């Protein structure tokens, strides 16, 4: 009837898209990059060791001042750190201890958290009576929250394990836009620097490009063989990198709509939990399940350095906005700052 | 020194925060955390009602011991993405009804309900995050098994059964089939109880099993066992 015809049309369209992608490729990234200077040796020393968490640390986010940091752990407590002096600014208890994500507002006024309780909680950091209160509880997701990122003080974007991304209005507590199209649990979110686009990575081994104000997908990116666990834009917003369980990081191109570079080693068989880019985009930092982080040359696909020093799985990375330091969180309840 | 007055005050505030975190540490570590699993609706409601969204937590105190139960029902997602959050639970409570060997899931005929429960038990007991985690097994609805076994033999579920169609032998066979699924016998134990009792004997069982688990945990930490 119509189902077979529609399936045939979809297959033909996919074939046409693949042909258009293939006709676009003329020279690989390695063919252009092979005549630039090597990055060299990257030796980063641990400058701080933030202690106080009593369980696995799952999420961490930097502040826009490159001094304040927020971390979440299974203790049921959110801690705000003064990375310069290791001091703690706040210790926010959580109603649900099963936290898996946290975010720090660009204005520094709010902190969000979420997890297995299906609720995004907004916390008011700057309050007249001195304590940190629960500003808003965002309900509506039927699956666990995996990532959340602030657009401004009134808009937030959340990803959930119900194959759905959402855009929220914090003042009204409603869901302004719902992003659908993923066939698996969505794991990661990353915002473009211009606050106009964002990409998400799900467990269907795929990545999608969204628009905030239109709620529709432009491009779908494939190539991974397992669940994508982390994703991060290039500094200029024209590329992004993903990490998955097949011990390989990709680099994807928005304007070319194609795979650019692959980052893999024969000695790595463990999945990737976190990816982050340096300020210039030359270095790509990836956290792994083998207890350490690898620094990758984003243009030469060559390993430049290793960040060892964690006794358990590295869960979360982060590079400051000025690009001065890298923060690594691990399941051993420790955060480390590197230079 | 080389610190201002405000820097010293901030350091003192951080020290107070550290003290509060440490103080909450012992309170968190002195609670028994239990993870409740179960296929479909076997004994899910009854175990909750004996204490009379997403994750559901139940708090109760029995004999100067505080108990944490986490119910993962209605969490229809991929299990391999949030099952590592319970790597440090004290024990796993598993509920299996006894009166479902004659039933079918009504979506797949070749899947038996007891076979589905066994598949889930095999998947959870042998998980890489639960190598040294004990499991308390609850066998619900034994009066239904009493009144159904006289008209339907157990051979409908197990073609290899070669025993009498009586309650005691069939219950023993079912328990043995469940305990044979454990292939980590050198590092965990499986506690079995028949929970179709109106009396408050299930909480006592849970207390005894948890006491045994903590005793072996302390022995392992000391090095004697």
């Amino acid at each position, epitope marked *: 009837s119509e189902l077979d015809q529609l399936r045939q049309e979809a297959e033909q369209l996919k074939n046409q898209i693949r042909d258009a992608r293939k006709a676009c490729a003329d020279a690989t990234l390695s063919q252009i990059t092979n005549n630039i200077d090597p990055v060299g040796r990257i030796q980063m020393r641990t400058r701080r060791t933030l202690r106080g968490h009593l369980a696995k640390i799952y999420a961490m986010h930097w502040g826009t001042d490159s001094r304040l940091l927020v971390s979440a752990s299974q203790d049921g407590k959110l801690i705000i750190w003064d990375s310069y002096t290791t*001091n703690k600014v706040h210790a926010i208890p959580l109603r649900s201890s099963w936290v898996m994500t946290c975010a720090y507002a660009p204005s*520094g006024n709010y902190v969000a958290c979420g997890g297995l309780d299906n609720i995004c909680s907004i916390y008011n950091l700057k309050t*007249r009576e*001195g304590n940190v209160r629960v500003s808003r509880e965002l309900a509506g997701h039927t699956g666990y929250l995996s990532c959340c990122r602030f657009l401004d003080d009134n808009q937030i974007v959340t990803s959930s394990g119900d194959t759905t991304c959402a855009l929220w209005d914090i003042e009204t507590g409603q869901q302004t836009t719902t992003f659908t199209g993923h066939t698996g649990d969505v794991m990661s979110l990353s915002l473009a620097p211009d606050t106009r686009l964002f990409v998400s990575g799900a467990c269907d081994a795929s990545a999608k490009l969204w628009d905030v104000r239109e709620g529709m997908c432009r491009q779908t990116f494939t190539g991974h063989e397992s669940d994508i666990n982390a994703i991060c834009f290039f500094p200029n917003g024209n590329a992004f990198a993903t990490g998955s369980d097949d011990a390989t990081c990709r680099l994807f191109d928005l304007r070319a709509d194609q795979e650019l570079m692959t980052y893999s080693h024969d000695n790595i068989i463990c999945g990737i939990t976190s990816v982050s880019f340096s300020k210039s985009g030359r270095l790509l930092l990836a956290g792994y399940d083998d207890f350490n982080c690898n620094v990758w040359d984003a243009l030469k696909a060559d390993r430049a350095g290793v960040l060892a020093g964690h006794d358990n799985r590295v869960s979360c990375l982060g590079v400051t906005d000025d690009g001065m330091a890298v923060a690594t969180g691990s399941w051993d309840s420790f955060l480390k700052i590197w230079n | 020194c080389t610190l201002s*007055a405000e820097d*010293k*005050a*901030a350091v003192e*505030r951080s020290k107070m925060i550290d003290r509060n975190l440490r103080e909450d540490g012992e309170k968190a570590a002195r609670e028994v955390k239990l993870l409740l699993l179960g296929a479909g609706e076997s004994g899910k409601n009854t175990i909750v009602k004996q204490m009379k969204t997403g994750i559901v937590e139940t708090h109760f105190t029995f004999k100067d011991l505080h108990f944490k139960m986490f119910d993962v029902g209605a969490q229809r997602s991929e299990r391999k993405k949030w099952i590592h959050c319970f790597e440090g639970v004290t024990a796993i409570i598993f509920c299996v009804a006894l009166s479902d060997y004659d039933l079918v899931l009504a979506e797949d005929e070749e899947m038996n309900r007891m076979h589905a429960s066994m598949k889930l038990f095999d998947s959870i007991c042998n998980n890489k995050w639960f190598t040294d985690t004990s499991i308390i097994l609850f066998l619900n609805k034994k009066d239904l098994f009493e009144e159904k076994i006289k008209k339907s033999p157990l051979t409908i579920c197990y073609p290899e059964y070669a025993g009498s169609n009586t309650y005691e032998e069939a219950a023993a066979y079912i328990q043995c089939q469940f305990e044979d699924l454990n292939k980590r016998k050198d590092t965990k134990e499986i506690y079995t109880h028949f929970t179709c009792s109106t009396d408050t004997k299930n909480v006592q069982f849970v207390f005894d099993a948890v006491t045994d688990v903590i005793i072996k945990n302390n022995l392992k930490d000391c090095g004697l066992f």
Partner: single-chain antibody, 234 residues
Framework: DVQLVESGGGLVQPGGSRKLSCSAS????????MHWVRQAPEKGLEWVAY????????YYADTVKGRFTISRDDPKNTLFLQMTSLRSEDTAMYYC??????????????WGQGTTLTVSSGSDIVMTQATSSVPVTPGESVSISCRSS???????????LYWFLQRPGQSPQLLIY???NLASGVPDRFSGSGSGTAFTLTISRLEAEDVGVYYC?????????FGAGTKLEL
């Protein structure tokens, strides 16, 4: 709302003892450090004591050591100042100041209504305000200067200087907390600038609501010192 209502004032014979109570309502009293600041009828602010959160650090002024005791009651949300061997120079208007300390905090942000107590008849930093009275027509910019005998530019990059405004018949309020940062609830027309030992406060587009006495205070090292105060008239 945030309130700090004081009690315990009156007329006191010399050598007596009276206790001042500072009742708190509307904020987390346990997480806030507390101060006592007094003002004599000669129109001059003067620091007295300070008790931190957790009652771990206690500081006294040099003129009250051995005579005054400061204590707090966190469950009852009350602050006590135990005063003994009172002299005629202790006649002032004792205020209760609320302060909190972390990165980017706004200390000295709320003040109590104060209480009146009447007694019958070296290395400290000097903050001086040369101008004592600046008559000016409303609607024009006003500059107020306050210089220091010691540099307030600490090695961490922060300059610890504060600006306060006291309207007639009211309690002092915060305007600038570290030389550049505007307080919460005050208009953007107030601006602070300076470097080293010279500090200025600019009030562009002056209105009649800003008429009062302006004080400058440092928080570099205890004891905290105020200025004489510049009064804006007309």
């Amino acid at each position: 709302d945030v309130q700090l209502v004081e009690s315990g004032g009156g007329l006191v014979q010399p050598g007596g003892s009276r206790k001042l109570s500072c009742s708190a309502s509307g904020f987390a009293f346990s997480s806030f450090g507390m101060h006592w600041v007094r003002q004599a009828p000669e129109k001059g602010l003067e620091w007295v004591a300070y008790i931190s959160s957790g009652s771990g650090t206690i500081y006294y002024a040099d003129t009250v050591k051995g005579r005054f005791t400061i204590s707090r009651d966190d469950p009852k949300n009350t602050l006590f100042l135990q005063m003994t061997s009172l002299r005629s120079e202790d006649t002032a208007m004792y205020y209760c100041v609320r302060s909190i300390y972390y990165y980017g905090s706004s200390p000295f942000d709320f003040w109590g209504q104060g209480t009146t107590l009447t007694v019958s008849s070296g290395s400290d930093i000097v903050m001086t305000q040369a101008t004592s009275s600046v008559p000016v027509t409303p609607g024009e910019s006003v500059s107020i200067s306050c210089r220091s005998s010691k540099s307030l530019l600490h090695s961490n990059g922060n300059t610890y200087l504060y600006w306060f405004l006291q309207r007639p018949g009211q309690s002092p309020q915060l305007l600038i907390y570290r030389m550049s940062n505007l307080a919460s609830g005050v208009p953007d027309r107030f601006s602070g600038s300076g470097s080293g030992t010279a500090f200025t406060l600019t009030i562009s587009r002056l209105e009649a609501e800003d008429v009062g006495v302006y004080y400058c205070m440092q928080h570099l090292e205890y004891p905290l010192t105020f200025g004489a105060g510049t009064k804006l008239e007309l």
